[PDB]
Design a protein around this nucleic acid. Structure first.
Ligand SMILES: [Mg+2]
Ligand SMILES: [Mg+2]
Ligand SMILES: [Mg+2]
Ligand SMILES: [Mg+2]
Ligand SMILES: [Mg+2]
Ligand SMILES: [Mg+2]
Ligand SMILES: [Mg+2]
Ligand SMILES: [Mg+2]
Ligand SMILES: [Mg+2]
Ligand SMILES: [Mg+2]
Ligand SMILES: [Mg+2]
Ligand SMILES: [Mg+2]
Ligand SMILES: [Mg+2]
Ligand SMILES: [Mg+2]
Ligand SMILES: [Mg+2]
Ligand SMILES: [Mg+2]
Ligand SMILES: [Mg+2]
Ligand SMILES: [Mg+2]
Ligand SMILES: [Mg+2]
Ligand SMILES: [Mg+2]
Ligand SMILES: [Mg+2]
Ligand SMILES: [Mg+2]
Ligand SMILES: [Mg+2]
Ligand SMILES: [Mg+2]
Ligand SMILES: [Mg+2]
Ligand SMILES: [Mg+2]
Ligand SMILES: [Mg+2]
Ligand SMILES: [Mg+2]
Ligand SMILES: [Zn+2]
Ligand SMILES: [Zn+2]
Lengths: 114, 91, 248, 60, 69, 50
RNA sequence: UUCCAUGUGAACAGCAGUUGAACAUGGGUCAGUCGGUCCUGAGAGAUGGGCGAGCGCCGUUCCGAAGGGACGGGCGAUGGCC
RNA sequence: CCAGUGCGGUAACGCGACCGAUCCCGGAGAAGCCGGCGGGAGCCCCGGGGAGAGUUCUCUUUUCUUUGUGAAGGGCAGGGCGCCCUGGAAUGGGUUCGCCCCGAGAGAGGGGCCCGUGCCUUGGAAAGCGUCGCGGUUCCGGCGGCGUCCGGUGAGCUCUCGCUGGCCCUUGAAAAUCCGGGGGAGAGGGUGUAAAUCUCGCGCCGGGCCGUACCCAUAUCCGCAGCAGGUCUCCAAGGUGAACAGCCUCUGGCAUGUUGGAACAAUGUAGGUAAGGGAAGUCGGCAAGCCGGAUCCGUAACUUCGGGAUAAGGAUUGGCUCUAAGGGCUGGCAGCCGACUUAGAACUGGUGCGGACCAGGGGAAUCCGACUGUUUAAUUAAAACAAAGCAUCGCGAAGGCCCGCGGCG
């Protein structure tokens, strides 16, 4: 069984020095030093624990080289906040201001009472 | 099956620490590892995240409470006293 | 003889507090117009665990009232607070749990924590895990207020300083026995280097004034004066009475 | 030689109480027996549920 | 390396200025035309042999053509 | 150490160029008192400082 | 420099050697992609300041006029089919 | 004349681009330890095909070696979702090895996204490797034929991905760096040979400085030395076996550790064996010895009810020939496959059978210390120290304790 060796001078089992195995076209098992597992973006809600959908999950300095559509989703607040909390904020930002209209109407008719 | 007679959650500590100390730890380990009902949705999923930090698994809502129980008797006493003082001030 | 352990704690070499993973200083927000005349609203964003602190912290976001920016801060979480709760604060913030309003307005018998000692210094009194301070009475002229602190002692306070209404979360912490030396180790490692206290008769008489002797005995009386020089001021510093407290 | 011995281990030889050194829970553990029996039985019950052999309530 | 499916795209690739050479690999079952552009190696994989020899007639003349084995 | 810095490697370069012996056309000079290189250095025995 | 080759056998290799990590001549380490370099960590450290007879020391945001940057617009010149 | 800062889907979201500044919000950077299970490879295993070798006194369709595809794209299996749509569930269902999920929408249909390290493909057969054979008598990345194939398994070992739970009076790093969004200040052209602007596809130019040999340890390091000492990591095959135990072996490595020869005396040092008695030896069972694995039974006092406990005490164990039970897949039945086990029975040997290795002596009591931990590196591992527990004492900050020659330290 062909035991094998590192190919850099870092000889410790660190987080940056982690590998996978591969079989080269000259029938030989060789390490390949893998890039770490990038995480998809988390929403700006603070509530939902699932990470966002439709956005690439890459190690973050790659995001220079990806195009715009690969990094957002085609919605208002998209690519930075989940859909459930977008529609919750739409309903909330509507209903608060409708209650504010109701409050100004009630206080204006209480002044008309006076 | 009932696997013990007296020790419950504190049969894990073996023959150690004293009968009175293991019996006194038992109530508190039960109380901090139980899952309490959330008052915000009703699901029985308040787990102790950290010491004084209860957290609902389903609301994703975190309640600062007691160190071993969701709320303390001094806390609910203080809450009733504060709402009584508020209604006596505000009439 | 040598320089004893209690003397060496004041040099700050290994006895500094282990404050890397701590979350920040837990302070009330700074006194401005919006808190001196009205009230400002901000929501609790989350509740975090400060290592070395038995009380949980409430990260609360207010809206900055002079430029479009959002301030975030850390409070002592009053017991019963939660996320998504609108904490109000100011002179006209109304009285319920989580708010922080000045002491001269809340009535007598209220239960406040993270209390502010001298007016403006962001909350010093009554801020350990589960511990409160009550408002006893007021004095409208000269604007001071007696406050019963958690030591059982009472203090006259200028009536313009803030206080979080309610007991501190994390209450009732000490009643569970730390069972084992591992729990004590992991407690005091996140606090600071103090835990394996070698008692003084186990030492040699060079580095503690009790050591030596062919019996582990103190020798000299353990109760000693306050004008003892350092390196002697060991054991029962100026005991008024000294025994088991039977009676009050 | 190894393969000629493992043929006899298939046939049941060399497996008596003399040629045994581990606990039975170490040789073939009872958690593994349990979980193999349950991936047998729960797949049997969902075959019989989906093939209309038993209904929802008898299944449960 | 880039594979080109249709034959018109390969002709447009081969007539590009960056193309230094094309090389024709004739194995069994298959014929591969590999053009060396300035960033990729574009391969056209075709299995019709009379269409292969027609395409070899249809290469542009100035490009360096090399048939491989 | 295969991770040398430039100053360390430069110092070692000077010491291994100094480690060469006497050139044999010297001991025929007129005012000579030299018979070998006394300041030599074997890499097991003397460890050079650093 | 012990690496590698050619040679030697005085000294060394606690015996011996035709051998050697010994001696003498010669070669040998090639990078955008592998590291350093960059970042902060526990920490270290000038400036303001304070102390100190004094070399200097404490201090690290505290008793500081602590930025040399920029969208745009106006001014005056330059080089280019102004 | 007027419009023209793109389009599609109910939606999750998609399409190859798809203007935009000071300002604000967020994400990645950025997280502990442990348990359980699942997916993927690497290796191992089994059944066949090739090619070459090994045995052949007899047997052996035998035994050994080898039997390949990189990075980066394109497609697809494969996992995962705390994503969307229809609809409304009790006779409660769904489901895991354990959990767990639901009128805050479960099952059931149909979609969407992420990772796709695996397969096919481009690279890629040209090259590599194995065989047979020609050339250059040389100086050859020389030239040729052939081949590099088809299946199965698994609580297997290592790595990695993912889900899920447990523990904490322990909550398990920062910053550079990069991106998305909210905003809408502005800019673009007047219908064209359009313009501003484009994070789409190509095309052009460049990436300086320093390190790179080798040893890595019973001979390249430090111990004055080629010193039995010490020195942080990575890879890890077959058998027996529970095993990374011990023992034997294959790839690889070495020459017995600063010498050889000849004898086999005393004293040793290190292994062993001993009749009969069994601690009578000696301060003392010191050293040795007994026991020892597994399966089936059986297990007392005492006790903090957790233990004690492998208590103690028995029996069984080999080889061989069998029987029975424990699964998938496809079309209560039939067919076809693939695993390790467990229980029992017979026969059988000079009663030997955990046959080597591995591998607890047992009990009744006293004293001390609760325990786990630490301790005098080089005469003391203990009853000492520490510990949780219990009780005191000081201190509400111009404060308690302490440092400092000094200071709004
Ligand atoms: Mg591959
Ligand atoms: Mg997209
Ligand atoms: Mg000092
Ligand atoms: Mg300590
Ligand atoms: Mg002592
Ligand atoms: Mg003294
Ligand atoms: Mg079980
Ligand atoms: Mg040395
Ligand atoms: Mg010699
Ligand atoms: Mg050599
Ligand atoms: Mg290159
Ligand atoms: Mg300094
Ligand atoms: Mg569903
Ligand atoms: Mg070939
Ligand atoms: Mg916008
Ligand atoms: Mg090297
Ligand atoms: Mg020997
Ligand atoms: Mg020898
Ligand atoms: Mg040696
Ligand atoms: Mg005898
Ligand atoms: Mg005998
Ligand atoms: Mg005698
Ligand atoms: Mg005797
Ligand atoms: Mg002994
Ligand atoms: Mg016993
Ligand atoms: Mg007694
Ligand atoms: Mg002890
Ligand atoms: Mg000692
Ligand atoms: Zn959300
Ligand atoms: Zn809830």
């Amino acid at each position: 069984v062909q035991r094998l060796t590192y190919r850099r001078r870092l000889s410790y089992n660190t987080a940056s020095n982690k590998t996978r195995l591969s079989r080269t076209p000259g029938n030989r098992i060789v390490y390949l030093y893998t890039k770490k597992v990038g995480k998809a973006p988390k929403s700006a809600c603070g509530v939902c624990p699932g990470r966002l959908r439709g956005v690439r999950a890459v190690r973050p300095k790659v995001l220079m080289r990806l195009s715009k559509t690969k990094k957002h989703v085609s919605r208002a607040y998209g690519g930075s906040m989940c859909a459930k909390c977008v529609r919750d904020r739409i309903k909330r930002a509507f209903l608060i201001e409708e209650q504010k209209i109701v409050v100004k109407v009630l206080k204006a008719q209480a002044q008309s009472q006076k | 099956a009932k696997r013990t007679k007296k020790v419950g959650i504190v049969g894990k500590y073996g023959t150690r620490y004293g009968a009175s100390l293991r019996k006194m730890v038992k109530k508190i380990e039960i109380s901090q590892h139980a899952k309490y009902t959330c008052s915000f949705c009703g699901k029985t999923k308040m787990k102790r995240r950290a010491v004084g930090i209860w957290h609902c698994g389903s609301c994703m809502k975190t309640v600062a409470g007691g160190a071993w129980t969701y709320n303390t008797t001094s806390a609910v006493t203080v809450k009733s006293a504060i709402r009584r003082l508020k209604e006596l001030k505000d009439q | 003889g040598r320089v004893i352990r209690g003397q060496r704690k004041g040099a700050g070499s290994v006895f500094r507090a282990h404050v890397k993973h701590r979350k920040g200083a837990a302070r009330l927000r700074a006194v401005d117009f919006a808190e001196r005349h009205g009230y400002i609203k901000g929501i609790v964003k989350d509740i975090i665990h400060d290592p070395g602190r038995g009380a949980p912290l409430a990260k609360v976001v207010f809206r900055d009232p002079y430029r479009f920016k959002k301030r975030t801060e850390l409070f002592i979480a009053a017991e019963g607070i939660h996320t998504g709760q609108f904490v109000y604060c100011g002179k006209k913030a109304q009285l319920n749990i989580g708010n922080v309003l000045p002491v001269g307005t809340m009535p007598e018998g209220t239960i406040v924590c993270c209390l502010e000692e001298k007016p403006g210094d962001r909350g010093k009194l009554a801020r350990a895990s589960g511990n409160y301070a009550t408002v006893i009475s007021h004095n409208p002229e000269t604007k001071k207020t007696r406050v019963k602190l958690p030591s059982g002692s009472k203090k006259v306070i200028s009536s313009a300083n803030r206080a979080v209404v309610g007991v501190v979360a994390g209450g009732g912490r000490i009643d569970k026995p730390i069972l084992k030396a591992g729990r004590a180790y992991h407690k005091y490692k996140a606090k600071r280097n103090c835990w394996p206290r070698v008692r003084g008769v186990a030492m040699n008489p060079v580095e503690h004034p009790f050591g030596g002797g062919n019996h582990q005995h103190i020798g000299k009386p353990s109760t000693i004066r306050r004008d003892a020089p350092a390196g002697r001021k060991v054991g029962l510093i100026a005991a008024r009475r000294t025994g088991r407290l039977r009676g009050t | 030689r190894c393969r000629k011995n493992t043929l006899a281990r298939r046939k049941g030889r060399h497996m008596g109480i003399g040629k045994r050194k581990g606990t039975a829970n170490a040789r073939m553990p009872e958690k593994v027996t349990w979980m193999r029996r349950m991936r047998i039985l729960r797949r049997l019950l969902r075959r019989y549920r989906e093939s209309k052999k038993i209904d929802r309530h008898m299944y449960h | 390396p880039r594979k080109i499916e249709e034959i018109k795209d390969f002709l447009l690739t081969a007539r590009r200025k960056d193309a230094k050479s094309v090389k024709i690999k004739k194995n069994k079952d298959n014929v591969k035309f590999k053009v060396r552009c300035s960033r990729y190696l574009y391969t056209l994989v075709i299995t019709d042999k009379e269409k292969a020899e027609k395409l070899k007639q249809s290469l542009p003349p100035g490009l360096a053509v090399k048939e491989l084995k | 150490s295969s991770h040398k810095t430039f100053r360390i490697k430069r110092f070692l370069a000077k010491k291994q160029k100094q480690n060469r012996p006497i050139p044999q056309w010297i001991w025929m000079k007129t005012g000579n008192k030299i018979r070998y290189n006394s300041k030599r250095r074997h890499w097991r025995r003397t460890k050079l400082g650093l």
